Amino acid sequence: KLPPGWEKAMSRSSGRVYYFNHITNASQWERPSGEPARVRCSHLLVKHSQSRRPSSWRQEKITRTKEEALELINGYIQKIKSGEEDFESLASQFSDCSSAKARGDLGAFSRGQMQKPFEDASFALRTGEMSGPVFTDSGIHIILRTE
Numbered sequence: 001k002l003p004p005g006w007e008k009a010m011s012r013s014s015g016r017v018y019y020f021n022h023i024t025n026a027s028q029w030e031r032p033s034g035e036p037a038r039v040r041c042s043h044l045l046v047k048h049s050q051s052r053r054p055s056s057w058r059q060e061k062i063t064r065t066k067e068e069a070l071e072l073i074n075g076y077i078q079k080i081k082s083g084e085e086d087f088e089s090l091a092s093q094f095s096d097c098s099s100a101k102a103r104g105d106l107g108a109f110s111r112g113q114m115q116k117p118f119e120d121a122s123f124a125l126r127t128g129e130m131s132g133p134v135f136t137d138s139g140i141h142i143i144l145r146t147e
Protein backbone atom coordinates (compact mmCIF):
# COMPACT_ATOMS: atom_id res chain seq x y z
CA LYS A 1 0.00 0.00 0.00
CA LEU A 2 2.37 2.62 1.39
CA PRO A 3 6.14 3.27 1.61
CA PRO A 4 8.22 1.62 4.37
CA GLY A 5 6.65 2.11 7.77
CA TRP A 6 3.59 4.19 6.83
CA GLU A 7 0.06 3.45 8.00
CA LYS A 8 -3.31 5.18 7.97
CA ALA A 9 -4.67 6.77 11.11
CA MET A 10 -7.69 8.84 12.09
CA SER A 11 -7.44 12.33 13.54
CA ARG A 12 -9.25 12.36 16.86
CA SER A 13 -10.30 15.97 16.56
CA SER A 14 -11.15 16.22 12.86
CA GLY A 15 -12.22 12.73 11.79
CA ARG A 16 -10.00 13.12 8.72
CA VAL A 17 -7.59 10.31 7.96
CA TYR A 18 -3.86 10.95 8.01
CA TYR A 19 -0.64 9.02 7.61
CA PHE A 20 1.76 8.06 10.36
CA ASN A 21 5.20 6.51 9.97
CA HIS A 22 6.13 4.31 12.91
CA ILE A 23 9.82 4.25 11.95
CA THR A 24 10.31 8.04 11.64
CA ASN A 25 7.31 9.18 13.77
CA ALA A 26 6.45 11.61 10.97
CA SER A 27 2.77 12.36 10.48
CA GLN A 28 1.05 14.23 7.66
CA TRP A 29 -2.34 14.68 6.05
CA GLU A 30 -1.04 13.87 2.56
CA ARG A 31 -0.58 10.28 1.33
CA PRO A 32 3.18 9.53 1.40
CA SER A 33 5.09 9.88 -1.86
CA GLY A 34 6.67 7.13 -3.97
CA GLU A 35 17.65 1.92 -0.20
CA PRO A 36 20.79 4.04 -0.57
CA ALA A 37 24.13 3.01 0.84
CA ARG A 38 24.46 6.37 2.59
CA VAL A 39 22.17 9.19 3.68
CA ARG A 40 23.01 12.66 4.90
CA CYS A 41 21.03 14.08 7.81
CA SER A 42 20.94 16.97 10.19
CA HIS A 43 19.35 16.72 13.59
CA LEU A 44 18.21 18.75 16.56
CA LEU A 45 18.85 16.83 19.78
CA VAL A 46 17.13 17.60 23.06
CA LYS A 47 18.84 15.84 25.92
CA HIS A 48 17.26 15.00 29.24
CA SER A 49 18.29 13.77 32.65
CA GLN A 50 18.36 10.11 31.51
CA SER A 51 20.48 10.88 28.42
CA ARG A 52 23.61 8.80 27.99
CA ARG A 53 25.64 11.94 28.80
CA PRO A 54 23.38 14.54 30.47
CA SER A 55 25.57 17.48 29.45
CA SER A 56 26.02 19.67 26.39
CA TRP A 57 27.58 22.92 25.17
CA ARG A 58 24.28 24.55 26.18
CA GLN A 59 24.23 23.16 29.75
CA GLU A 60 26.91 21.60 31.94
CA LYS A 61 24.18 19.64 33.76
CA ILE A 62 21.08 18.77 31.74
CA THR A 63 18.33 18.33 34.32
CA ARG A 64 15.14 18.35 32.26
CA THR A 65 12.97 15.23 32.27
CA LYS A 66 12.34 13.15 29.16
CA GLU A 67 8.76 14.41 29.15
CA GLU A 68 9.96 18.03 29.29
CA ALA A 69 12.47 17.27 26.52
CA LEU A 70 9.69 15.78 24.39
CA GLU A 71 7.53 18.84 24.92
CA LEU A 72 10.42 21.01 23.68
CA ILE A 73 10.83 18.74 20.67
CA ASN A 74 7.09 18.93 20.00
CA GLY A 75 7.20 22.73 20.09
CA TYR A 76 10.19 22.98 17.77
CA ILE A 77 8.48 20.67 15.29
CA GLN A 78 5.42 22.89 15.44
CA LYS A 79 7.42 26.01 14.57
CA ILE A 80 9.29 24.25 11.75
CA LYS A 81 6.12 22.86 10.19
CA SER A 82 4.35 26.23 10.48
CA GLY A 83 7.38 27.99 9.00
CA GLU A 84 7.64 30.32 12.00
CA GLU A 85 11.18 28.94 12.30
CA ASP A 86 13.68 27.00 10.13
CA PHE A 87 15.09 23.64 11.19
CA GLU A 88 18.65 24.96 10.78
CA SER A 89 17.98 28.01 12.95
CA LEU A 90 16.45 26.03 15.83
CA ALA A 91 19.17 23.40 15.58
CA SER A 92 21.89 26.08 15.88
CA GLN A 93 20.21 27.64 18.90
CA PHE A 94 18.86 24.65 20.80
CA SER A 95 20.42 21.32 19.75
CA ASP A 96 22.25 19.68 22.67
CA CYS A 97 24.66 18.18 20.12
CA SER A 98 28.02 19.55 19.00
CA SER A 99 26.56 19.56 15.49
CA ALA A 100 24.47 22.61 16.46
CA LYS A 101 27.46 24.70 15.33
CA ALA A 102 26.93 23.26 11.81
CA ARG A 103 23.15 23.89 11.80
CA GLY A 104 22.71 20.28 12.91
CA ASP A 105 24.52 18.72 9.94
CA LEU A 106 26.03 15.31 10.74
CA GLY A 107 27.37 14.60 7.26
CA ALA A 108 26.70 11.36 5.47
CA PHE A 109 26.66 7.97 7.16
CA SER A 110 26.02 4.30 6.49
CA ARG A 111 24.04 1.69 8.36
CA GLY A 112 25.94 0.45 11.41
CA GLN A 113 27.29 3.88 12.44
CA MET A 114 24.51 5.69 14.33
CA GLN A 115 22.29 4.68 17.20
CA LYS A 116 19.77 2.27 15.71
CA PRO A 117 16.50 4.26 16.11
CA PHE A 118 18.23 7.27 14.60
CA GLU A 119 19.64 5.15 11.76
CA ASP A 120 16.27 3.53 10.93
CA ALA A 121 14.45 6.87 10.88
CA SER A 122 17.19 8.44 8.76
CA PHE A 123 16.99 5.71 6.14
CA ALA A 124 13.18 5.67 6.18
CA LEU A 125 13.05 9.41 5.48
CA ARG A 126 12.78 10.49 1.89
CA THR A 127 15.20 13.15 0.74
CA GLY A 128 13.95 16.44 2.11
CA GLU A 129 11.74 14.83 4.75
CA MET A 130 11.79 15.41 8.48
CA SER A 131 11.07 12.96 11.26
CA GLY A 132 8.94 13.32 14.33
CA PRO A 133 10.49 12.78 17.74
CA VAL A 134 13.03 9.97 17.51
CA PHE A 135 14.17 8.47 20.79
CA THR A 136 17.71 7.22 21.32
CA ASP A 137 20.03 6.86 24.26
CA SER A 138 21.34 10.40 23.62
CA GLY A 139 17.91 11.92 23.99
CA ILE A 140 15.20 13.02 21.57
CA HIS A 141 15.96 13.97 17.96
CA ILE A 142 14.26 15.79 15.13
CA ILE A 143 15.97 14.38 12.04
CA LEU A 144 16.12 16.11 8.66
CA ARG A 145 17.29 14.03 5.73
CA THR A 146 19.22 16.22 3.31
CA GLU A 147 20.75 13.67 0.91
Ligand SMILES: Cc1cc(CO)n(C)n1
Residues within 6 Å of the ligand: 097, 098, 099, 100, 101, 102, 104, 105, 106, 107
Ligand atom coordinates in the same frame (compact mmCIF):
# COMPACT_ATOMS: atom_id res chain seq x y z
C1 LIG B 1 29.02 15.58 16.00
C2 LIG B 1 29.40 16.66 15.03
C3 LIG B 1 29.52 16.58 13.64
C4 LIG B 1 29.88 17.83 13.21
C5 LIG B 1 30.17 18.35 11.85
O1 LIG B 1 29.02 18.52 11.05
N1 LIG B 1 29.96 18.60 14.34
C6 LIG B 1 30.30 20.02 14.43
N2 LIG B 1 29.67 17.89 15.47
